């Protein structure tokens, strides 16, 4: 009985020793000669209004012009970022929404949250109205994040400490990913789309495989819940935002942490993390009413996106890298540039 | 709990059997990618107001 | 300036804004009540007197109440509790008879300490509900309260404790300045529980109105 | 008719103190209007009405600098051919706006703390602006009607002449009705909030002192004008005119009362930082 | 299914009045703008009137300004056009067209069956020089419709639409915004061009594509249709 636990502990020690062996000059030693990105001043080009509650999620369409925002008001507004128009106002059934996702094709938006139901709304109906195409059920806990794969497969992360890949047409759990301990608070998909990483509240992140269906790698090094996660554009690294004010950028190939983006002036948690088009800049939705954008190669803070009157809950960067929407608990989106 | 322990041990073995590259090479690749694509980052280098869609 | 399509799109945006404003006004006219509990404590009884989130819409005295029974959640409370930052009250059912059962009142008191002192609810009143009065009286007659509260000294008869459990629930409120933990023994009461809820919610609404107004 | 007036030593000594009080009220009104710069975090119907009262104060607070025509001590006005014709309207506008907005805030408080679940307490901010503009229009209405330059001295004119026509009764009613509304609202607020429900909190106590202060300031500031006008009407009815020493003393008393009526401007910004989160 | 049926036709004496009504059926009428397009017994189409979503702003053609009245009844899901003082030239068969306007939408998506009416006895001038052109099946054809004003707005959109009408059939949309194919249309059709110069391109023209092809501006709201190019043989 205890022999299995002893073998597991020995394997964990061996893995830690192997990682230590692969360790070398840190990212600071490599990118020490690189010049700093310089001060980044960023103006609120647009300020979308219309929500009557706290925004909990946002996502940029593939066209980088349309974004869908979910708020505890119960509404799923689809904005037109260029002109601050509202294309649609979906009346979500359950007002407790905590995620949203814009399908790559632009024909679907997903919403979920405390209802434990992932609803797949439709946008290109012949009747000119948004009709719930399918309401996925099966998660025994609050839904945290959902992301479309191409158009029919959608992966979800819920509070039952499991991630699942669905089949929208069938409405059944095609593959279930298990192995986490705490609530899986956030999810992110690799650009290659055959891999994705999830950050659970047990202070650990895992590298899942959509195809075969098991945790390829396990990453640790945090000290609190991982409230957000995002892939590096090259699809070989990801960054996690913990509750201890520490964005950490890991690597898939080396299976190690590279930096710990921390500052003593920050003592508040993290809500969202997203890179830039090249990944040189890494944003972060700190809950102390502002978002701090840091250089992802020297860990130096390089600008502050202040201007929100409450906690910055959701943050996202466009596909072309022309803007960074930040949705705060104040009922206001805000597109920066 | 024996099945859970066996599953955890198998998962640990699977996650330890993977070959890991040197961290220096990964850092070099990251820096190279960032330098190569820094040209196409409007987020980093402020784009001219003519080409900025959010004029606003 | 704007082409025809752009003008019609702005028309659609104005219509969407009008619908959003109307629905927001309708929602604000309603009153939201989070309902916590220790589990089995008697939330069923009070919810009868009126997967995931189990809502309940009941109206009284031309006021639309919304009770969000959240006992079905099994995840960690710290992550989703901030969703209820805006509720005007927190009904908190507690099983009085459970003092000798298994020590469940210690768990209930721990939950009360977690909820009342939570950073998210520094200004939301707690409508404490003490029910199962008949069973509590029968048990108190059978056995004293020293099983769960050895520090108590008294005749160990009902109402001789002077709602001793109620006292221990009230003093658990650390921030007594910015909230009031209303208590009310929930017997059959001839449908007076809804009345107590109404007075408590009205008091909270008055406090909110005065706080907003200058 | 009028007999003009005399014995202006008091009107040359004390109204300077009135002007000093007006400058202090101007500072207070600037602090109250500073919400556009600092206290702009959130705007609600009560905040809208309080800012309206601040604007009504600031109108006279800036009209006092408009009283800068060099020498003015007792009866020596200059450069007022129309200037002071507008100044009189500005002063009447300030007084009427103060009265109307005091009544508005009192009624708003009554609705907020007596009928809590009422649609009026959740009026949209745009509706607040619309109703604010409506009240402003009513105030400019009355003011004009009541007012409708070179009379003897370049600027001296008021109701000293007794034209009867019972318009003085109209002005007295236009004062009493706000007083009745405010007294009724305050009494209902206190009685309901304290008797029916316990509400022993410090916040509740402070909100009680607000309405007490508002009622006291209103009565203390505006009752003397009402009583002196009533006395003037009674003297018009009894013995008529030409005993102008008596109405001269009455006019001196009315100037003294008017000193407090415009000291209401300096007393107004008390409410800000006496019952609202400020500083 | 979405279907638009309009009624209110029949012979009417000149100078009289007549009400024409459209009957919506299951396409969320209340959030759909509606147009009225007329077809002369031998000539091409011509815009008549328009009512926005929620009975908001409303426009008319110069030829029928004041004379005609258009109204909608959302609860009844029915669209009314009230005509007064019908003239001899007013004879035409009237089509009932829906259109929804938002980013990426497809205005003029569906066309009603049409109501035949007979009467007893700015303004960007689009042009279709080619009146007709025969073509054998399996070949590629190109129809050019030159405009008289720059249709490329500052937003980058080119507000040109292409409609194909089968013989004795209600016209249907083919391409909107000069490049975006309609939903359900075959991929053979393709539009291109530039400001003041457009040319629809169809490759491997199969059967059932013969008919009059119309081009349409949407910049200046007094819309104008093309003369219409017919495909034969
Ligand atoms: C400020 C200075 C010009 N001043 N002195 N007495 C005054 C009386 C009035 C008045 O009755 O409206 C206005 C201004 C007065």
PDB file of N, CA and C in Angstrom, chain E residues 36-95:
ATOM      1  N   UNK E  36     -39.640  47.945 -49.711  1.00  0.00           N
ATOM      2  CA  UNK E  36     -40.688  47.686 -50.697  1.00  0.00           C
ATOM      3  C   UNK E  36     -40.057  47.943 -52.059  1.00  0.00           C
ATOM      4  N   UNK E  37     -39.945  46.904 -52.875  1.00  0.00           N
ATOM      5  CA  UNK E  37     -39.337  47.007 -54.194  1.00  0.00           C
ATOM      6  C   UNK E  37     -40.397  46.679 -55.233  1.00  0.00           C
ATOM      7  N   UNK E  38     -40.510  47.527 -56.249  1.00  0.00           N
ATOM      8  CA  UNK E  38     -41.514  47.372 -57.289  1.00  0.00           C
ATOM      9  C   UNK E  38     -40.833  46.967 -58.585  1.00  0.00           C
ATOM     10  N   UNK E  39     -41.562  46.251 -59.430  1.00  0.00           N
ATOM     11  CA  UNK E  39     -41.074  45.859 -60.742  1.00  0.00           C
ATOM     12  C   UNK E  39     -42.096  46.264 -61.790  1.00  0.00           C
ATOM     13  N   UNK E  40     -41.663  47.071 -62.750  1.00  0.00           N
ATOM     14  CA  UNK E  40     -42.525  47.449 -63.850  1.00  0.00           C
ATOM     15  C   UNK E  40     -42.863  46.217 -64.685  1.00  0.00           C
ATOM     16  N   UNK E  41     -43.992  46.238 -65.398  1.00  0.00           N
ATOM     17  CA  UNK E  41     -44.380  45.045 -66.174  1.00  0.00           C
ATOM     18  C   UNK E  41     -43.362  44.650 -67.230  1.00  0.00           C
ATOM     19  N   UNK E  42     -42.515  45.580 -67.670  1.00  0.00           N
ATOM     20  CA  UNK E  42     -41.486  45.252 -68.644  1.00  0.00           C
ATOM     21  C   UNK E  42     -40.112  45.808 -68.300  1.00  0.00           C
ATOM     22  N   UNK E  43     -39.996  46.694 -67.318  1.00  0.00           N
ATOM     23  CA  UNK E  43     -38.731  47.324 -66.987  1.00  0.00           C
ATOM     24  C   UNK E  43     -38.128  46.680 -65.739  1.00  0.00           C
ATOM     25  N   UNK E  44     -37.032  47.257 -65.253  1.00  0.00           N
ATOM     26  CA  UNK E  44     -36.334  46.725 -64.104  1.00  0.00           C
ATOM     27  C   UNK E  44     -36.930  47.180 -62.788  1.00  0.00           C
ATOM     28  N   UNK E  45     -36.267  46.772 -61.710  1.00  0.00           N
ATOM     29  CA  UNK E  45     -36.743  47.066 -60.369  1.00  0.00           C
ATOM     30  C   UNK E  45     -36.507  48.534 -60.024  1.00  0.00           C
ATOM     31  N   UNK E  46     -37.149  48.974 -58.945  1.00  0.00           N
ATOM     32  CA  UNK E  46     -37.009  50.345 -58.474  1.00  0.00           C
ATOM     33  C   UNK E  46     -37.439  50.402 -57.019  1.00  0.00           C
ATOM     34  N   UNK E  47     -36.599  50.997 -56.178  1.00  0.00           N
ATOM     35  CA  UNK E  47     -36.911  51.115 -54.762  1.00  0.00           C
ATOM     36  C   UNK E  47     -38.121  52.017 -54.559  1.00  0.00           C
ATOM     37  N   UNK E  48     -38.928  51.692 -53.547  1.00  0.00           N
ATOM     38  CA  UNK E  48     -40.181  52.389 -53.276  1.00  0.00           C
ATOM     39  C   UNK E  48     -40.181  53.031 -51.895  1.00  0.00           C
ATOM     40  N   UNK E  49     -40.010  52.228 -50.851  1.00  0.00           N
ATOM     41  CA  UNK E  49     -40.113  52.728 -49.490  1.00  0.00           C
ATOM     42  C   UNK E  49     -39.266  51.847 -48.584  1.00  0.00           C
ATOM     43  N   UNK E  50     -39.217  52.206 -47.305  1.00  0.00           N
ATOM     44  CA  UNK E  50     -38.447  51.454 -46.325  1.00  0.00           C
ATOM     45  C   UNK E  50     -38.859  51.848 -44.919  1.00  0.00           C
ATOM     46  N   UNK E  51     -38.995  50.874 -44.028  1.00  0.00           N
ATOM     47  CA  UNK E  51     -39.262  51.134 -42.622  1.00  0.00           C
ATOM     48  C   UNK E  51     -38.211  50.400 -41.806  1.00  0.00           C
ATOM     49  N   UNK E  52     -37.595  51.104 -40.863  1.00  0.00           N
ATOM     50  CA  UNK E  52     -36.482  50.540 -40.121  1.00  0.00           C
ATOM     51  C   UNK E  52     -36.983  49.570 -39.060  1.00  0.00           C
ATOM     52  N   UNK E  53     -36.054  49.063 -38.260  1.00  0.00           N
ATOM     53  CA  UNK E  53     -36.423  48.246 -37.119  1.00  0.00           C
ATOM     54  C   UNK E  53     -37.097  49.107 -36.061  1.00  0.00           C
ATOM     55  N   UNK E  54     -38.128  48.554 -35.429  1.00  0.00           N
ATOM     56  CA  UNK E  54     -38.821  49.277 -34.378  1.00  0.00           C
ATOM     57  C   UNK E  54     -39.539  50.519 -34.849  1.00  0.00           C
ATOM     58  N   UNK E  55     -39.923  50.565 -36.125  1.00  0.00           N
ATOM     59  CA  UNK E  55     -40.655  51.697 -36.692  1.00  0.00           C
ATOM     60  C   UNK E  55     -39.924  53.012 -36.442  1.00  0.00           C
ATOM     61  N   UNK E  56     -38.609  52.992 -36.624  1.00  0.00           N
ATOM     62  CA  UNK E  56     -37.807  54.176 -36.406  1.00  0.00           C
ATOM     63  C   UNK E  56     -37.811  55.075 -37.622  1.00  0.00           C
ATOM     64  N   UNK E  57     -36.634  55.479 -38.083  1.00  0.00           N
ATOM     65  CA  UNK E  57     -36.559  56.328 -39.260  1.00  0.00           C
ATOM     66  C   UNK E  57     -37.069  55.597 -40.494  1.00  0.00           C
ATOM     67  N   UNK E  58     -37.535  56.381 -41.461  1.00  0.00           N
ATOM     68  CA  UNK E  58     -38.311  55.880 -42.586  1.00  0.00           C
ATOM     69  C   UNK E  58     -38.019  56.759 -43.791  1.00  0.00           C
ATOM     70  N   UNK E  59     -37.906  56.136 -44.959  1.00  0.00           N
ATOM     71  CA  UNK E  59     -37.537  56.849 -46.170  1.00  0.00           C
ATOM     72  C   UNK E  59     -38.528  56.520 -47.274  1.00  0.00           C
ATOM     73  N   UNK E  60     -38.415  57.249 -48.380  1.00  0.00           N
ATOM     74  CA  UNK E  60     -39.299  57.064 -49.519  1.00  0.00           C
ATOM     75  C   UNK E  60     -38.545  57.406 -50.792  1.00  0.00           C
ATOM     76  N   UNK E  61     -39.065  56.919 -51.911  1.00  0.00           N
ATOM     77  CA  UNK E  61     -38.539  57.314 -53.206  1.00  0.00           C
ATOM     78  C   UNK E  61     -39.119  58.661 -53.611  1.00  0.00           C
ATOM     79  N   UNK E  62     -38.383  59.374 -54.464  1.00  0.00           N
ATOM     80  CA  UNK E  62     -38.837  60.690 -54.901  1.00  0.00           C
ATOM     81  C   UNK E  62     -40.139  60.593 -55.686  1.00  0.00           C
ATOM     82  N   UNK E  63     -40.307  59.522 -56.461  1.00  0.00           N
ATOM     83  CA  UNK E  63     -41.502  59.360 -57.277  1.00  0.00           C
ATOM     84  C   UNK E  63     -42.758  59.117 -56.451  1.00  0.00           C
ATOM     85  N   UNK E  64     -42.628  58.634 -55.218  1.00  0.00           N
ATOM     86  CA  UNK E  64     -43.793  58.282 -54.416  1.00  0.00           C
ATOM     87  C   UNK E  64     -43.772  59.017 -53.082  1.00  0.00           C
ATOM     88  N   UNK E  65     -42.913  60.025 -52.961  1.00  0.00           N
ATOM     89  CA  UNK E  65     -42.816  60.766 -51.711  1.00  0.00           C
ATOM     90  C   UNK E  65     -44.148  61.424 -51.382  1.00  0.00           C
ATOM     91  N   UNK E  66     -44.615  61.218 -50.154  1.00  0.00           N
ATOM     92  CA  UNK E  66     -45.883  61.774 -49.726  1.00  0.00           C
ATOM     93  C   UNK E  66     -47.087  60.973 -50.177  1.00  0.00           C
ATOM     94  N   UNK E  67     -47.055  60.495 -51.423  1.00  0.00           N
ATOM     95  CA  UNK E  67     -48.192  59.762 -51.967  1.00  0.00           C
ATOM     96  C   UNK E  67     -48.412  58.443 -51.237  1.00  0.00           C
ATOM     97  N   UNK E  68     -47.334  57.754 -50.876  1.00  0.00           N
ATOM     98  CA  UNK E  68     -47.400  56.423 -50.290  1.00  0.00           C
ATOM     99  C   UNK E  68     -47.083  56.488 -48.802  1.00  0.00           C
ATOM    100  N   UNK E  69     -47.700  55.595 -48.032  1.00  0.00           N
ATOM    101  CA  UNK E  69     -47.458  55.495 -46.600  1.00  0.00           C
ATOM    102  C   UNK E  69     -47.165  54.046 -46.245  1.00  0.00           C
ATOM    103  N   UNK E  70     -46.087  53.825 -45.499  1.00  0.00           N
ATOM    104  CA  UNK E  70     -45.645  52.491 -45.111  1.00  0.00           C
ATOM    105  C   UNK E  70     -45.675  52.390 -43.594  1.00  0.00           C
ATOM    106  N   UNK E  71     -46.254  51.305 -43.088  1.00  0.00           N
ATOM    107  CA  UNK E  71     -46.341  51.070 -41.657  1.00  0.00           C
ATOM    108  C   UNK E  71     -46.203  49.581 -41.383  1.00  0.00           C
ATOM    109  N   UNK E  72     -45.830  49.261 -40.149  1.00  0.00           N
ATOM    110  CA  UNK E  72     -45.626  47.886 -39.723  1.00  0.00           C
ATOM    111  C   UNK E  72     -46.364  47.632 -38.418  1.00  0.00           C
ATOM    112  N   UNK E  73     -46.820  46.396 -38.247  1.00  0.00           N
ATOM    113  CA  UNK E  73     -47.505  45.954 -37.035  1.00  0.00           C
ATOM    114  C   UNK E  73     -46.758  44.733 -36.510  1.00  0.00           C
ATOM    115  N   UNK E  74     -45.793  44.971 -35.622  1.00  0.00           N
ATOM    116  CA  UNK E  74     -44.983  43.876 -35.094  1.00  0.00           C
ATOM    117  C   UNK E  74     -45.807  42.813 -34.379  1.00  0.00           C
ATOM    118  N   UNK E  75     -46.737  43.148 -33.473  1.00  0.00           N
ATOM    119  CA  UNK E  75     -47.519  42.078 -32.829  1.00  0.00           C
ATOM    120  C   UNK E  75     -48.275  41.210 -33.816  1.00  0.00           C
ATOM    121  N   UNK E  76     -48.773  41.792 -34.901  1.00  0.00           N
ATOM    122  CA  UNK E  76     -49.433  41.018 -35.939  1.00  0.00           C
ATOM    123  C   UNK E  76     -48.459  40.445 -36.959  1.00  0.00           C
ATOM    124  N   UNK E  77     -47.178  40.814 -36.882  1.00  0.00           N
ATOM    125  CA  UNK E  77     -46.159  40.356 -37.828  1.00  0.00           C
ATOM    126  C   UNK E  77     -46.584  40.634 -39.268  1.00  0.00           C
ATOM    127  N   UNK E  78     -47.015  41.867 -39.515  1.00  0.00           N
ATOM    128  CA  UNK E  78     -47.559  42.239 -40.810  1.00  0.00           C
ATOM    129  C   UNK E  78     -47.085  43.640 -41.174  1.00  0.00           C
ATOM    130  N   UNK E  79     -46.778  43.832 -42.456  1.00  0.00           N
ATOM    131  CA  UNK E  79     -46.232  45.081 -42.968  1.00  0.00           C
ATOM    132  C   UNK E  79     -47.209  45.703 -43.955  1.00  0.00           C
ATOM    133  N   UNK E  80     -47.534  46.978 -43.744  1.00  0.00           N
ATOM    134  CA  UNK E  80     -48.524  47.694 -44.536  1.00  0.00           C
ATOM    135  C   UNK E  80     -47.868  48.772 -45.383  1.00  0.00           C
ATOM    136  N   UNK E  81     -48.351  48.918 -46.615  1.00  0.00           N
ATOM    137  CA  UNK E  81     -48.012  50.052 -47.469  1.00  0.00           C
ATOM    138  C   UNK E  81     -49.313  50.650 -47.981  1.00  0.00           C
ATOM    139  N   UNK E  82     -49.616  51.873 -47.555  1.00  0.00           N
ATOM    140  CA  UNK E  82     -50.843  52.557 -47.939  1.00  0.00           C
ATOM    141  C   UNK E  82     -50.538  53.535 -49.065  1.00  0.00           C
ATOM    142  N   UNK E  83     -51.195  53.346 -50.203  1.00  0.00           N
ATOM    143  CA  UNK E  83     -50.975  54.162 -51.385  1.00  0.00           C
ATOM    144  C   UNK E  83     -52.205  55.010 -51.669  1.00  0.00           C
ATOM    145  N   UNK E  84     -51.974  56.280 -51.993  1.00  0.00           N
ATOM    146  CA  UNK E  84     -53.036  57.223 -52.309  1.00  0.00           C
ATOM    147  C   UNK E  84     -52.762  57.858 -53.662  1.00  0.00           C
ATOM    148  N   UNK E  85     -53.834  58.113 -54.414  1.00  0.00           N
ATOM    149  CA  UNK E  85     -53.759  58.756 -55.725  1.00  0.00           C
ATOM    150  C   UNK E  85     -52.819  57.990 -56.657  1.00  0.00           C
ATOM    151  N   UNK E  86     -53.185  56.739 -56.922  1.00  0.00           N
ATOM    152  CA  UNK E  86     -52.389  55.903 -57.810  1.00  0.00           C
ATOM    153  C   UNK E  86     -52.441  56.451 -59.230  1.00  0.00           C
ATOM    154  N   UNK E  87     -51.274  56.595 -59.845  1.00  0.00           N
ATOM    155  CA  UNK E  87     -51.161  57.112 -61.200  1.00  0.00           C
ATOM    156  C   UNK E  87     -51.072  55.965 -62.199  1.00  0.00           C
ATOM    157  N   UNK E  88     -51.121  56.322 -63.484  1.00  0.00           N
ATOM    158  CA  UNK E  88     -51.015  55.313 -64.532  1.00  0.00           C
ATOM    159  C   UNK E  88     -49.646  54.649 -64.519  1.00  0.00           C
ATOM    160  N   UNK E  89     -48.590  55.429 -64.282  1.00  0.00           N
ATOM    161  CA  UNK E  89     -47.249  54.860 -64.234  1.00  0.00           C
ATOM    162  C   UNK E  89     -47.036  54.027 -62.978  1.00  0.00           C
ATOM    163  N   UNK E  90     -47.929  54.148 -61.997  1.00  0.00           N
ATOM    164  CA  UNK E  90     -47.766  53.426 -60.743  1.00  0.00           C
ATOM    165  C   UNK E  90     -48.004  51.931 -60.880  1.00  0.00           C
ATOM    166  N   UNK E  91     -48.505  51.464 -62.022  1.00  0.00           N
ATOM    167  CA  UNK E  91     -48.738  50.037 -62.202  1.00  0.00           C
ATOM    168  C   UNK E  91     -47.417  49.280 -62.175  1.00  0.00           C
ATOM    169  N   UNK E  92     -47.366  48.228 -61.365  1.00  0.00           N
ATOM    170  CA  UNK E  92     -46.169  47.420 -61.167  1.00  0.00           C
ATOM    171  C   UNK E  92     -46.541  46.275 -60.238  1.00  0.00           C
ATOM    172  N   UNK E  93     -45.691  45.257 -60.211  1.00  0.00           N
ATOM    173  CA  UNK E  93     -45.828  44.166 -59.261  1.00  0.00           C
ATOM    174  C   UNK E  93     -44.841  44.395 -58.127  1.00  0.00           C
ATOM    175  N   UNK E  94     -45.357  44.469 -56.906  1.00  0.00           N
ATOM    176  CA  UNK E  94     -44.601  44.963 -55.764  1.00  0.00           C
ATOM    177  C   UNK E  94     -44.043  43.804 -54.951  1.00  0.00           C
ATOM    178  N   UNK E  95     -42.742  43.848 -54.691  1.00  0.00           N
ATOM    179  CA  UNK E  95     -42.057  42.846 -53.892  1.00  0.00           C
ATOM    180  C   UNK E  95     -41.871  43.345 -52.468  1.00  0.00           C
TER     181      UNK E  95
END
